[PDB]
């Protein structure tokens, strides 16, 4: 268990309402980490406590190649801290903005890795991520997926276990969440569908600037694909983007296993995905460990109760 002093504070990575994330060096070890620094007042007043704590419990209790690992969690008088694995490759949202579209091979790589992570969270851990999107999907130094931001997760979902909270990101909300229905772990697959649609098609499958119009598209409009899209992809995205979750690929008792079996993923050995044996079709070209070029330019340039049982240190 350690404090604020045991770190150097090098580069800003992102600001939010609730606080900031800074690229840190661990004095004792020389290892680079990302630190989320939450102002306690903002948390309590904006009523973000429950999420903050859910992210704590979720991170502590998860260990996976494509999930951001948590090393320390500690609190000062006025702050809450999360020292986490640094993902210097930046956000998928960054890269895809630059490149417009990824190739199917490339989208399959990220897809497989996301499936690996989501499967683990579902069938072990009994968690539902709920907020899958390009912004929450980062790359490490090698070009492997790291998922961050676990505040909107739900714990204790075991199969058909259904939820009620209306949360996520409007553009990614699954039809059953948009109806005010009870929803199972299959919203994550809807999310996978939208993410992968965006990677292969270069755009959101449903978009209006206006949320209600947007929700109306999501509920009523049937998917359309670019004519250059291969049928294996087309099938996958159809399956994932089914509006009735009971029909959605991943919606049954098989969960991720159903998506893993899809012919879009024919050549993928799922053990090798997990073991990082696969060749990333993009390596982030960071020279130094402090190279923050895949992070947003506006941040990169430097620009109250006690929480019981919040403190935590990673074991062995």
């Amino acid at each position: 268990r350690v404090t604020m002093n045991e770190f150097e504070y090098l580069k800003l990575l992102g600001k939010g309402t609730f606080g900031k994330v800074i690229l840190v060096k661990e004095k004792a070890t020389g290892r680079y980490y990302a630190m989320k620094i939450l102002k306690k007042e903002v948390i309590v007043a904006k009523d973000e406590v429950a999420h903050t704590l859910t992210e704590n419990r979720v991170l502590q209790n998860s260990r996976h190649p494509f999930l951001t690992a948590l090393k320390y969690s500690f609190q000062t008088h006025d702050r809450l801290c999360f020292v986490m694995e640094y993902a210097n490759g930046g956000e998928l949202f960054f890269h895809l903005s630059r490149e417009r579209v990824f190739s199917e091979d490339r989208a399959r790589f990220y897809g497989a890795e996301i499936v690996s992570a989501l499967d683990y969270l579902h069938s072990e851990k009994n968690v539902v991520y709920r907020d899958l999107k390009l912004e929450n999907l980062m790359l490490d130094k090698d070009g492997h997926i790291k998922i961050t931001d676990f505040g909107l997760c739900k714990e204790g979902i075991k199969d058909g276990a259904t939820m009620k909270t209306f949360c996520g990101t409007p553009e990614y909300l699954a039809p059953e969440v948009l109806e005010d229905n009870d929803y199972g772990r299959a919203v994550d697959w809807w999310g996978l569908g939208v993410v992968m649609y965006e990677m292969m098609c270069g755009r959101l499958p449903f978009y209006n600037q206006d949320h209600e119009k947007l929700f109306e598209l999501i509920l009523m409009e049937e998917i359309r694909f670019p004519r250059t899209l291969g049928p294996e992809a087309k099938s996958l995205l159809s399956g994932l983007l089914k509006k009735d979750p009971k029909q959605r690929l991943g919606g049954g008792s098989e969960d991720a296993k159903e998506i893993m079996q899809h012919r879009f993923f024919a050549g993928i050995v799922w053990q090798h995905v997990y073991e990082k044996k696969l060749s990333p079709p993009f390596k982030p070209q960071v020279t130094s460990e402090t190279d923050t070029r895949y992070f947003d330019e506006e941040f990169t340039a430097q620009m109250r109760p006690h929480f019981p049982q919040f403190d935590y240190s990673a074991s062995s």
Binding site: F93, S97, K133, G151, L152, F166, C167, P170, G202, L204
Partner: peptide, 10 residues
């Protein structure tokens, strides 16, 4: 392409 999105809770 698209603008940056914001996560939310009811």
């Amino acid at each position: 392409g698209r603008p940056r999105t914001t996560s939310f809770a009811e």
